[PDB]
């Protein structure tokens, strides 16, 4: 819409089946935190910020309970019109210039995600890795689909090749976005 | 330390299915001008909205028609007040010491691939200027910059490619200005190879 800054203080996402909820704060398009609804805890992306401000997680549980209720009401209202799938798009890029000797992070940015249920995983040399992986929450887009990012720490080498694998309902087969150092 | 933030309050209405609530505080020149908008969304259809510039709830589509009167009756004064109790408050009490103070200085590296690449990484906030120079004068022809790349971790990067001829005695410089820097960063590349 236009401003110097945009804060979103309490994005609620609530889905069925599964009672799948997500609760977040964003500022200038970055994630301040999400509320872990099972642990009832505010999880800050920058732990530093957590020492300088706070958020009581009960604020997330309250707004999620309103989500569970509005979903009931709006689903019936629409005559149970279901969500139409989209096909998510993946891009792989390194966090900093890739130099031998220098630990680095591969980023898999996935955009056009709708609905917000997705499995993003990493392959090193065509085998699964779970060590060194972190992922963000779903970020809102102007058209109300979502984006999400995943991260794999790595030691650069001319021997290794990578894929970010994305599974989604809107896909006939998983995306494998391939990456290699030149 | 600091203050507890206050959420925008998601208001109660009277095969995969989704709702979303999306609140937005638009700040211009600090908290001098604030526009506040809350979006009520079913799957990806925004059906009901509050907009502070309108002053009340409006149905955006027909799915929101059953809501707009009940909301204006039931929720309006509280919602209106959120421009101050959510937007102004969160900004002044919480963003000021955290987001608005965040300053991360760019890392500037020149590599080959002939194309020189000036990689400017790990910086915050977004505002940046990155220019290629050849033997002391600004190079514009054959120069392309990416858009701002958001790393998703509270940092940005930008890559600026120069298509080049690595003649002897030719000196290339990448120059970077950012709010975190007192004066510009400059990094040199000489043929051969820096």
Characteristics of this structure?
heterodimer, A: 182 residues, Class II Histocompatibility Antigen, M Beta Chain, Chain B, domain 1, Immunoglobulin-like, 2 domains, five-stranded antiparallel sheet, 1 helix, 11% helix, B: 194 residues, mainly beta, four-stranded antiparallel sheet, 2 helices, 13 strands, elongated
Structural class of chain B: mainly beta
The structural domain count of chain B equals 2
Structural class of chain A: mainly beta
What share of the residues of chain A does DSSP label as strand, in percent? 35-45%
What is the ordering of alpha helices and beta strands of chain B? EEEEHHEEEEEEEEE
What's the overall geometry of chain B? elongated
State the helical fraction of chain A: 10-25%
- The span between the termini of chain B is 48 Å
Oligomeric status: heterodimer
The largest interface is:
A-B, 71 and 72 residues
Separation, N- and C-terminal Cα atoms of chain A: 40 Å
- Overall tally of domains of chain A: 2
What form of chain A results from the Cα inertia axes? Answer: globular
**Count the helices of chain A. How many?**
1
* Top CATH class of the largest domain in chain B: Mainly Beta
Look up the CATH topology of the largest domain in chain B: Immunoglobulin-like
Kindly describe this structure.
It is classed as immune system. Keywords: MHC, I-Au, immunoglobulin fold, MBP, immune system. It forms a dimeric assembly. The complex is a heterodimer of chains A (182) and B (194). With 182 residues, chain A is mainly beta. Chain A folds into 2 domains: 3-82, Roll (Class II Histocompatibility Antigen, M Beta Chain, Chain B, domain 1); 83-182, Immunoglobulin-like (Sandwich), CATH 2.60.40.10. Helix content of chain A is 11%, strand content 45%. Chain A contains 1 helix and 13 strands, in the order E-E-E-E-H-E-E-E-E-E-E-E-E-E. In chain A, strands 5, 6, 9, 10 and 11 form a 5-stranded antiparallel beta sheet that branches. In chain A, strands 1-2-3-4 form a 4-stranded antiparallel beta sheet, with helices on one face. A 4-stranded antiparallel beta sheet of chain A has the order 8-7-12-13, with no helix packed on it. By secondary structure, chain B is mostly beta strands. Chain B folds into 2 domains: 15-101, Class II Histocompatibility Antigen, M Beta Chain, Chain B, domain 1, CATH 3.10.320; 102-194, Immunoglobulins (Immunoglobulin-like). Chain B contains 2 helices and 13 strands. Chain B has helices spanning 68-74, 76-95, and strands at 17-28, 33-42, 45-51, 56-59, 107-112, 115-123, 129-134, 137-139, 143-145, 149-150, 156-163, 171-177, 185-190. In chain B, the strands form 3 sheets. In chain B, strands 5, 6, 9, 10 and 11 form a 5-stranded antiparallel beta sheet that branches. In chain B, strands 1-2-3-4 form a 4-stranded antiparallel beta sheet. The two termini of chain B are 48 Å apart.
């Amino acid at each position: 819409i236009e401003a110097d800054h945009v804060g979103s203080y309490g994005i609620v996402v609530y889905q069925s089946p599964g009672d799948i909820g997500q609760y977040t704060f964003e500022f200038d398009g970055d994630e301040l935190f999400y509320v872990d609804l099972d642990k009832k805890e505010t999880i800050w992306m920058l732990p530093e910020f957590a020492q300088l401000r706070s958020f009581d997680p009960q604020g997330g549980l309250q707004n999620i309970a309103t989500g569970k209720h509005n979903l009931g009401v709006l689903t019936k209202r629409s005559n149970s019109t279901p969500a139409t799938n989209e096909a998510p798009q993946a891009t792989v890029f390194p966090k900093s210039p890739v130099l031998l000797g220098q630990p680095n992070t591969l980023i898999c940015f996935v955009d056009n995600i709708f609905p917000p249920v997705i499995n993003i995983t990493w392959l090193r040399n065509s085998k699964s890795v779970a060590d060194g992986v972190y992922e963000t929450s779903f970020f809102v887009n102007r058209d109300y689909s979502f984006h999400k990012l995943s991260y794999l720490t790595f030691i650069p080498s001319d021997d290794d090749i990578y894929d970010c694998k994305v599974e989604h309902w809107g896909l006939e087969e998983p995306v494998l976005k391939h990456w290699e150092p030149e | 330390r600091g203050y507890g933030g206050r959420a925008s309050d998601y208001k109660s209405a009277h095969r995969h299915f989704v709702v979303q609530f999306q609140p937005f505080c638009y700040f211009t020149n600090g908290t001098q001008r604030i526009r506040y908008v809350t979006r009520y969304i079913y799957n990806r259809e925004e059906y009901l909205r509050f907009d502070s510039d309108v002053g009340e709830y409006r149905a955006v589509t027909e799915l929101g028609r059953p809501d707009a009167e009940y909301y204006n009756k039931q929720y309006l004064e509280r919602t209106r007040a959120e421009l101050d109790t959510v937007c102004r408050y969160n900004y002044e009490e919480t963003e000021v010491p955290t987001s608005l103070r965040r300053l991360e200085q760019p890392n500037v590296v020149i590599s080959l691939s002939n194309t020189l690449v000036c990689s400017v990484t790990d910086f915050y906030p977004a505002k940046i200027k990155v220019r290629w120079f050849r033997n002391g004068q600004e190079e514009t022809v054959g120069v392309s910059s990416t858009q701002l790349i958001r790393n998703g971790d509270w940092t940005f990067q930008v890559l600026v490619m120069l298509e080049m001829t690595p003649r002897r005695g030719e000196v290339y410089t990448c120059h970077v200005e950012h709010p975190s820097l007192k004066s510009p960063i400059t990094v040199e590349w000489r043929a051969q190879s820096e």
